[PDB]
Design a protein around this ligand. Structure first.
Ligand SMILES: [Mg+2]
Ligand SMILES: [Mg+2]
Ligand SMILES: [Mg+2]
Ligand SMILES: [Mg+2]
Ligand SMILES: [Mg+2]
Ligand SMILES: [Mg+2]
Ligand SMILES: [Mg+2]
Ligand SMILES: [Mg+2]
Ligand SMILES: [Mg+2]
Ligand SMILES: [Mg+2]
Ligand SMILES: [Mg+2]
Ligand SMILES: [Mg+2]
Ligand SMILES: [Mg+2]
Ligand SMILES: [Mg+2]
Ligand SMILES: [Mg+2]
Ligand SMILES: [Mg+2]
Ligand SMILES: [Mg+2]
Ligand SMILES: [Mg+2]
Ligand SMILES: [Mg+2]
Ligand SMILES: [Mg+2]
Length: 62
RNA sequence: AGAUGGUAAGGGCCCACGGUGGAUGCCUCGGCACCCGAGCCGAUGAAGGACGUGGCUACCUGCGAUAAGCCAGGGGGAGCCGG
């Protein structure tokens, strides 16, 4: 259901849009690295966080 | 003084049981033929690949650094996160 949620947020991301798109993506990107960085060490990772964040990025990218 | 009976190191034939081997029968996601349909794709980068892509992934499948996926329109009505 998280889809309907984030979607509206993105045309909502039309304060600055292409610019905030980029700002927001870059952010989600870091969170992703921070994530897999901790995922590699083992004792700081669950799971579904990644794929959810991965696809999260995708629709932002759209 | 004479006679003709036992032994099986092993071998043979037959019976029983077993090993090995994978024929025969049954089966079938595959193949074959015909008939009907349908019949082009590419510089808006094809056909076909290489590399990559999953939290743990060797291969196959799918996909392309948005990477077993992204958006929207239909379908569908309880399961789903390929093998
Ligand atoms: Mg721009
Ligand atoms: Mg994933
Ligand atoms: Mg955009
Ligand atoms: Mg004698
Ligand atoms: Mg004997
Ligand atoms: Mg003997
Ligand atoms: Mg056998
Ligand atoms: Mg042309
Ligand atoms: Mg050109
Ligand atoms: Mg191709
Ligand atoms: Mg990999
Ligand atoms: Mg996954
Ligand atoms: Mg990984
Ligand atoms: Mg890996
Ligand atoms: Mg592959
Ligand atoms: Mg990615
Ligand atoms: Mg897929
Ligand atoms: Mg999956
Ligand atoms: Mg899983
Ligand atoms: Mg399953």
């Amino acid at each position: 259901m998280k889809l309907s949620e984030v979607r509206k947020q993105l045309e909502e991301a039309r304060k600055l849009s292409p610019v905030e798109l980029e700002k927001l993506v870059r952010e989600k990107k870091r969170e992703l690295m921070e994530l897999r960085f901790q995922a590699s060490i083992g004792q700081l990772s669950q799971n579904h966080k990644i794929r959810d964040l991965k696809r999260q990025i995708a629709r932002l990218l759209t």
